[PDB]
Amino acid sequence: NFSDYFTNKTLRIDYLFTGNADKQSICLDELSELPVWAGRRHHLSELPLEGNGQIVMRDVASGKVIYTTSFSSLFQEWLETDEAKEVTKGFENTYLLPYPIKPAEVEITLRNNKREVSANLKHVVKPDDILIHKKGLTHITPHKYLLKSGNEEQCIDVAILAEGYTTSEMETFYKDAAIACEALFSHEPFQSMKNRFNIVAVASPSADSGVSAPKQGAWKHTAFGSHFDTFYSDRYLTTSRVKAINDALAGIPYEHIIILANTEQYGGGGIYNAFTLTTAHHPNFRPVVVHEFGHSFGGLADEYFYDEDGLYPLNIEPWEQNITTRINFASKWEDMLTKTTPVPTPVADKAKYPIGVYEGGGYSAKGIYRPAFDCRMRTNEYPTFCPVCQRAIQRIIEFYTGK
Amino acid sequence: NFSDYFTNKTLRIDYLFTGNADKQSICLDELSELPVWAGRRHHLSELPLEGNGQIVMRDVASGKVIYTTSFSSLFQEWLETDEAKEVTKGFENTYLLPYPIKPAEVEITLRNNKREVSANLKHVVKPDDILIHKKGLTHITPHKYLLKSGNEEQCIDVAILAEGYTTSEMETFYKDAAIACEALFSHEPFQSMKNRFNIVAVASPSADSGVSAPKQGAWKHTAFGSHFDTFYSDRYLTTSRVKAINDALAGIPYEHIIILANTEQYGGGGIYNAFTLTTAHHPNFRPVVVHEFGHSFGGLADEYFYDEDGLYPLNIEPWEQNITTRINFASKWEDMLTKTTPVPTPVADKAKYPIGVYEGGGYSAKGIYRPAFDCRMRTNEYPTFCPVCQRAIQRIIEFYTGK
Ligand SMILES: [Cl-]
Ligand SMILES: [Cl-]
Ligand SMILES: [Cl-]
Ligand SMILES: [Cl-]
Ligand SMILES: [Cl-]
Ligand SMILES: [Cl-]
Ligand code: NA
Ligand code: NA
Ligand SMILES: [Zn+2]
Ligand SMILES: [Zn+2]
Ligand SMILES: [Zn+2]
Ligand SMILES: [Zn+2]
């Protein structure tokens, strides 16, 4: 089932997502080959989560689905900003697929907030195409394994990258990476499932120490050009240099990316099957890196909300597992409630019901509900993922490594 | 005046040109600021040449044209390939504009072979936007001036970049750059106009020596990732890493770019107001670098042609100054012919008429005409630019630096 269509190599595909609030398009940027396939070898035609976008690989000769993955993107978030009503922008996006033996047809799809198709691209990949850029053979970024439970075929490979660390600050980076690892494996279900993971710390160098602070006019030369003030949101620390992120990892087996930023300023970002980015020297580093990994690895939604008032239409059940609009609550955590739990669960009864249907979630105070009064996905001070987030993360771990 | 709308800074705009043979689009990639404006300060609302694409900057408050430039692109050439009928691709393109004091509206337009609009983007640039990336203040690439005739405001600044040269091969690079300079200023009108130019050699390092050869499976880590087999044409050496090219030059004043590739293999190209790329160690380096600069700086067309058979429709007068379809020959070099010069000029009379209307030009043996039997824009063996190419180049030099 894996050996019938694939070789133990990776087909890396770089795309450009372009558009504005009115129309979106996808175009191919570049095809590359990586030396090993670090992804799954089972459930090849199934998705663990829908994502905001999907990739389907089909065998050209038979037309059969041979691989599928899903994700979210910085582009799809940008579409929800005021700037997307005024200008057309382009964004880099990279996806890792198993390398096919015979020609394969790749189809990439983007969906809107109504979970409808908003952009699509279908293209044929010929495995002997001379313009498939061979990567990860030489000048592999210095790295060290923090944790090695097994080979890349049996464990989940997580790569931790250095952002804003010069070559002389790498001992601080490796210490920071060890702290992220300790924070992650102190949370269930990661704690009990630690032997399912490989953690590699990748010493990707920056010319400058620290990160770009656009609001203060302090731009720096760094490995991935990360910056605060993403979408003019002060604490939103992201990078749109997705090709540079993946080029730094070429030759190192990886499935998931965590980026550590060498700064004391508060900030971070996390996007499903894209990457996590976080401050390493702010005191809230430990809950923040785990919260962002909840997004990037877990595909979890934010459970916090604001008082003031469109990202989750109330007529649509979200695909995210830890929030509901009560359209299709049976597909969520209804099976985890007691027979007498009130729906919605009044805030006055929070102590009576550790698991409930609490109004407020996915940035809205009304119409969106979360599974517990508090969670790692709602606040930094709360010590754990709620029971529903824990089940959702365990399902992801088991999808990639078995029951 | 220049000072009425601009500051002594550059607004660098990075775009992505995307599409296929059927439809094309433009989207914004990033806005940057460079410390000085090295371009012109006169004829701000005029174009020296039409180009295959145009940029018009307007003051938002008055709607008045405050800056304009024109160009051609690798994307517009890719549109003519078989691949453009099968897939949608994206290309990086960078343009330097003077930095506005007040909000400005930028309009970028691409034209097809019928000289009609094929893609357009209109967007407002607010000079106080915090997300305008400040560049060229630190980590300025090591460089040396080969020629300094005056400051960046009075002279044409030409930058020569190193491709495929490691840090230990920079003495060879500077020798190669001196050879390119010597070849260029041994040709009229450059020779007599040498005091109108600044030439800077920029030692942009490469991890590997040489350039990528996709057909041989020899991929290299180089400054700008130049490679052979572009568009599956074996000897076509190009780079599409336009952001990396401009990032290497941030902080160094430049208007025109020449890239030298550390290889003996034959290859290169020149695209109007994009860049020249050529191999420094092939024996044809001297006439080739000058021929390509004829394209990238001069906007000149190729005067050579093939026997066998759409880039130049025969019912349209080309915008290039050294070829004609005799649709509007009066706008070309008619004023340089003697009253008795036969039109077309028979090949038997080539010695009698140094300037004529010789059939064969712009890749076609029929319907397109060139100004002399031979020229630097037709062959490598011919020693000089024809008198019409010389006048066209002189008009470009005078447009940017005065009569
Ligand atoms: Cl069958
Ligand atoms: Cl929408
Ligand atoms: Cl390794
Ligand atoms: Cl800091
Ligand atoms: Cl239900
Ligand atoms: Cl060579
Ligand atoms: Na793995
Ligand atoms: Na200048
Ligand atoms: Zn969050
Ligand atoms: Zn939760
Ligand atoms: Zn040419
Ligand atoms: Zn000529």
How many CB atoms within 10 Å of residue B217? 10
CA nearest to A178, candidates A144, A209, A211: A144
**Could you say which of A115, A137, A159 is where a domain stops?**
A137
Within 13 Å and on the Cβ side, how many CA atoms surround A294? 32
B295 is in an annotated binding site: yes
Residue B131 and residue A89: Cβ atoms within 8 Å? no
Contacts of B359 by beta carbon, 8 Å cutoff, 6+ apart: B344, B365, B366, B367, B368, B369
Distance of CA B231 to the CA centre of its chain: 19
Burial of A313 per CB tally in 10 Å (0-12, 13-18, 19+): middle
Domain extent for B125: 1-137
Please give the Cα distance from A311 to A300 (Å, whole number).
15
Q: What is the 3-state secondary structure (H, E, C) of chain A?
A: CCCCCEEEEEEEEEEEEEECCCCEEEEEEEEEEECCCCCCCCCCCCCCCCCCEEEEEEECCCCCEEEEEEECCHHHHHCCCHHHHCCCEEEEEEEEEEEECCCEEEEEEEECCCCCEEEEEEEEECCCCCCCEECCCCCCCCEEEEEECCCCCCCEEEEEEEECCCHHHHHHHHHHHHHHHHHHCCCCCCCCCHHHEEEEEECCCCCCCCCEEHHHCECCCCCCCCECCECCECCECECCCHHHHHHHHCCCCCCEEEEEECCCCCCEEEECCCEEEEECCCCCHHHHHHHHHHHHCCCCCCCCEECCCCCCCCCCCCCCCCCECCCCHHHCCHHHCCCCCCCCCCHHHCCCCCCCCEEEECEEEEEEEECCCCCCCCCCCCCCCCHHHHHHHHHHHHHHHCC
DSSP-derived secondary structure letter, B213: B
Whether residue A325 lies inside any domain: the answer is no
Whole-number Å distance, alpha carbon A269 to ligand 2 midpoint, is 21
CA angle B123, B127, B132 (to 5 degrees): 80
Q: Which one of B20, B29, B92 would you mutate to disrupt binding with A, by most A Cβ within 10 Å of its Cβ?
A: B29
Numbered residues of chain B with Cβ closer than 8 Å to any chain A Cβ: 16, 18-19, 25-29, 86-90, 121, 123-124, 130-131, 133-135, 137-139, 207-208, 214-215, 217, 219, 221, 229, 232
> In this structure, which ligand is nearest to the CA of B264?
6
Q: Which one of A25, A75, A228, A234 would you mutate to disrupt binding with B, by most B Cβ within 10 Å of its Cβ?
A: A25
Burial of B188 per CB tally in 10 Å (0-12, 13-18, 19+): middle
Residue B241 has phi, psi (to 5 degrees) of -90, 65
CA distance B93 to chain A (A): 12
In 3-state terms, what secondary structure has residue B194? Answer: helix
Which residues in chain B have their CB less than 8 angstroms from residue A138's CB? 208, 221
DSSP string over B241-256:
-HHHHHHHHTTS--SE
Contacts of B224 by beta carbon, 8 Å cutoff, 6+ apart: B161, B163, B204, B239, B241, B244, B245, B248, B259
Considering the domain architecture, whether residues B241 and B373 belong to the same structural domain is answered as yes
Please give the Cα distance from A28 to B90 (Å, whole number).
7
Whole-number Å distance, alpha carbon B41 to ligand 8 midpoint, is 9
Residue A27 and residue B232: Cβ atoms within 8 Å? no
CA distance B87 to chain A (A): 7
Please give the Cα distance from B45 to B381 (Å, whole number).
39
Residue A138 and residue B16: Cβ atoms within 8 Å? no
Question: Could you tell me if B34 and B27 are in contact, meaning their C-beta atoms sit under 8 angstroms apart?
Answer: no
**Distances B335 to B25, B86, B112, B178, B391 between C-alpha atoms, Å:** 40, 46, 29, 37, 12
Question: Could you tell me if B355 and B373 are in contact, meaning their C-beta atoms sit under 8 angstroms apart?
Answer: no
Please give the Cα distance from B188 to B326 (Å, whole number).
27
Q: How many residues does chain A have?
A: 403
Method: X-ray
**Distances B147 to A181, A218, B199, B200 between C-alpha atoms, Å:** 55, 34, 5, 7
Number of H helices, E strands in chain B: 5, 17
**β-strand partners of A20:** none
Q: Which residue of B has its CA nearest to A207?
A: B139
Please give the Cα distance from B187 to B179 (Å, whole number).
13
State the helix-helix crossing angle for B170-184 and B285-296, rounded to 10 degrees: 70
Contacts of B403 by beta carbon, 8 Å cutoff, 6+ apart: none
Which residues in chain A have their CB less than 8 angstroms from residue B232's CB? 130-131
**Of B90, B135, B139, which is closest to A27 when you measure between CB atoms?**
B90
Q: Which one of B130, B139, B241 would you mutate to disrupt binding with A, by most A Cβ within 10 Å of its Cβ?
A: B130
Considering the domain architecture, whether residues B51 and B133 belong to the same structural domain is answered as yes
B302 is in an annotated binding site: yes
Contacts of A172 by beta carbon, 8 Å cutoff, 6+ apart: A165, A262
**Distances A394 to A159, A294, A333, A402, B149 between C-alpha atoms, Å:** 20, 12, 14, 10, 69
How many CB atoms within 10 Å of residue A269? 23
**Could you say which of A77, A112, A137 is where a domain stops?**
A137
Q: How many residues does chain B have?
A: 403
Considering the domain architecture, whether residues B50 and B127 belong to the same structural domain is answered as yes
First to last CA, chain A: 19
Question: Could you tell me if B18 and A27 are in contact, meaning their C-beta atoms sit under 8 angstroms apart?
Answer: yes
Dihedral of CA atoms B70, B72, B75, B80 in degrees, nearest 10, equals 130
Whole-number Å distance, alpha carbon B298 to ligand 12 midpoint, is 11
**Of A138, A207, A214, which is closest to B139 when you measure between CB atoms?**
A207
**Distances A173 to A153, A204, A236, A262 between C-alpha atoms, Å:** 27, 10, 21, 8
Question: Could you tell me if A211 and A228 are in contact, meaning their C-beta atoms sit under 8 angstroms apart?
Answer: yes
**Distances A184 to A196, A291, B247 between C-alpha atoms, Å:** 13, 9, 37
Question: Could you tell me if B295 and B271 are in contact, meaning their C-beta atoms sit under 8 angstroms apart?
Answer: yes
Whether residue A312 lies inside any domain: the answer is no
CA quadruple B263, B265, B266, B271: dihedral positive or negative? Answer: negative
- Which amino acid does the sequence have at A44? L
Annotate B285-298 with b (16+ C-beta within 10 A) or e (fewer): bbbbbbbbbbbbbb
Whole-number Å distance, alpha carbon A236 to ligand 9 midpoint, is 10
Please give the Cα distance from B54 to B107 (Å, whole number).
8
Whole-number Å distance, alpha carbon A291 to ligand 9 midpoint, is 6
CATH number of the domain that A219 lies in?
3.40.390.10
Please give the Cα distance from A273 to B103 (Å, whole number).
38
**Distances B371 to B214, B288, B307, B353, B366 between C-alpha atoms, Å:** 39, 20, 19, 10, 14
**Of B28, B87, B121, which is closest to A123 when you measure between CB atoms?**
B87
Which residues in chain B have their CB less than 8 angstroms from residue A123's CB? 86-87
Which residues of B74-116 form beta strands (DSSP E)?
A: 89-100, 104-111
Whether residue B319 lies inside any domain: the answer is no
Please give the Cα distance from A314 to B105 (Å, whole number).
38
Whether residue B325 lies inside any domain: the answer is no
B291 is in an annotated binding site: yes
Considering the domain architecture, whether residues A88 and A29 belong to the same structural domain is answered as yes
Q: Which one of B88, B231, B243 would you mutate to disrupt binding with A, by most A Cβ within 10 Å of its Cβ?
A: B88
Domain count, chain A: 2
Residue B124 and residue A86: Cβ atoms within 8 Å? yes
CA distance A16 to chain B (A): 7
Pairing assessment for the beta strands A65-71 and A53-59 based on DSSP bridges: antiparallel
**Of B90, B130, B138, which is closest to A29 when you measure between CB atoms?**
B90
A292 is in an annotated binding site: yes
Which residues in chain A have their CB less than 8 angstroms from residue B28's CB? 87-90
Within 13 Å and on the Cβ side, how many CA atoms surround B115? 11
Report whether the peptide linkage leading into residue A383 is cis, meaning its omega lies within 30 degrees of zero. Answer: no
Please give the Cα distance from B30 to A241 (Å, whole number).
11
Residue A342 has phi, psi (to 5 degrees) of -70, 140
Please give the Cα distance from A95 to A274 (Å, whole number).
9
Q: Which residue of A has its CA nearest to B134?
A: A219
State the helix-helix crossing angle for A170-184 and A285-296, rounded to 10 degrees: 70
Considering the domain architecture, whether residues B63 and B91 belong to the same structural domain is answered as yes
First to last CA, chain B: 19
DSSP-derived secondary structure letter, B302: P
**Of B87, B133, B137, which is closest to A28 when you measure between CB atoms?**
B87
Considering the domain architecture, whether residues B166 and B131 belong to the same structural domain is answered as no
Considering the domain architecture, whether residues A15 and A41 belong to the same structural domain is answered as yes
Q: What is the CA radius of gyration of chain B?
A: 21
Distance of CA A96 to the CA centre of its chain: 13
Whole-number Å distance, alpha carbon A328 to ligand 5 midpoint, is 4
Residue recorded with tokens 């070829």: B323
**Of B16, B134, B207, which is closest to A18 when you measure between CB atoms?**
B16
DSSP-derived secondary structure letter, B334: G
Token pair for A254: 């990886």
Please give the Cα distance from B35 to B67 (Å, whole number).
18
**Distances A226 to A276, B293, B343, B374 between C-alpha atoms, Å:** 12, 36, 62, 53
> In this structure, which ligand is nearest to the CA of A144?
3
Please give the Cα distance from A367 to A337 (Å, whole number).
19
Considering the domain architecture, whether residues B211 and B259 belong to the same structural domain is answered as yes
Residues surrounding ion ligand 4 at CB below 5 Å: A 263-264
Which residues in chain A have their CB less than 8 angstroms from residue B88's CB? 25-28, 121
How many CB atoms within 10 Å of residue B392? 26
Token pair for A174: 């490796």
Backbone φ/ψ region at B234: left (φ over 0), alpha (ψ -120 to 50), beta: alpha
**β-strand partners of B157:** B198
Within 13 Å and on the Cβ side, how many CA atoms surround A211? 30
Please give the Cα distance from B46 to B68 (Å, whole number).
7
Whether residue A318 lies inside any domain: the answer is no
CA nearest to A143, candidates A299, A256, A249: A249
Pairing assessment for the beta strands A363-370 and A358-361 based on DSSP bridges: antiparallel
Burial of A115 per CB tally in 10 Å (0-12, 13-18, 19+): middle
Q: Which residue of B has its CA nearest to A20?
A: B27
Residue recorded with tokens 């919605």: A344
Question: Could you tell me if A261 and A277 are in contact, meaning their C-beta atoms sit under 8 angstroms apart?
Answer: yes
Whether residue A327 lies inside any domain: the answer is no
Question: Could you tell me if A375 and A305 are in contact, meaning their C-beta atoms sit under 8 angstroms apart?
Answer: no
Residue A134 and residue B207: Cβ atoms within 8 Å? no
In 3-state terms, what secondary structure has residue B342? Answer: coil
Pairing assessment for the beta strands B6-19 and B89-100 based on DSSP bridges: antiparallel
Considering the domain architecture, whether residues B218 and B142 belong to the same structural domain is answered as yes
CA nearest to B332, candidates B311, B313, B317, B315: B317
Report whether the peptide linkage leading into residue B287 is cis, meaning its omega lies within 30 degrees of zero. Answer: no
Considering the domain architecture, whether residues B269 and B370 belong to the same structural domain is answered as yes
B181 is in an annotated binding site: no
Residue A217 and residue B121: Cβ atoms within 8 Å? no
CATH number of the domain that B125 lies in?
2.60.40.3250
Please give the Cα distance from B114 to B111 (Å, whole number).
8
Which residues in chain B have their CB less than 8 angstroms from residue A134's CB? 217, 219
Whole-number Å distance, alpha carbon B28 to ligand 4 midpoint, is 30
**Could you say which of A137, A169, A198 is where a domain stops?**
A137
Please give the Cα distance from B331 to B323 (Å, whole number).
11
Long-range contacts of B243-246 (CB under 8 A, 24+ apart): B243/B14, B243/B29, B243/B30, B243/B92, B243/B94, B245/B94, B245/B161, B245/B275, B246/B12, B246/B14, B246/B94
B27 is in an annotated binding site: no
> In this structure, which ligand is nearest to the CA of B370?
12
CA nearest to A152, candidates A364, A368, A365, A8: A8
Residue B170 has phi, psi (to 5 degrees) of -70, -25
- Which amino acid does the sequence have at B29? D
Please give the Cα distance from A330 to B364 (Å, whole number).
70
B176 is in an annotated binding site: no
Whether residue A323 lies inside any domain: the answer is no
Considering the domain architecture, whether residues B162 and B102 belong to the same structural domain is answered as no
Contacts of A48 by beta carbon, 8 Å cutoff, 6+ apart: A70, A299, A395, A396, A399, A400
**Of A18, A221, A229, which is closest to B131 when you measure between CB atoms?**
A229
Please give the Cα distance from A197 to A188 (Å, whole number).
14
DSSP string over B384-395:
S--HHHHHHHHH
CA distance B11 to chain A (A): 16
Whole-number Å distance, alpha carbon B263 to ligand 6 midpoint, is 4
Considering the domain architecture, whether residues A209 and A279 belong to the same structural domain is answered as yes
- Which amino acid does the sequence have at A62? S
Residue A166 has phi, psi (to 5 degrees) of -80, 170
Please give the Cα distance from B50 to A297 (Å, whole number).
51
**Of A28, A221, A229, which is closest to B88 when you measure between CB atoms?**
A28
Whether residue B329 lies inside any domain: the answer is no
Which residues of B218-362 form beta strands (DSSP E)?
A: 256-261, 268-271, 275-279, 305-306, 358-361
Report whether the peptide linkage leading into residue A189 is cis, meaning its omega lies within 30 degrees of zero. Answer: yes
**Of B16, B221, B232, which is closest to A16 when you measure between CB atoms?**
B16
Q: Which residue of B has its CA nearest to A26?
A: B88
B71 sits in which H/E element = strand B65-71
B155 is in an annotated binding site: no
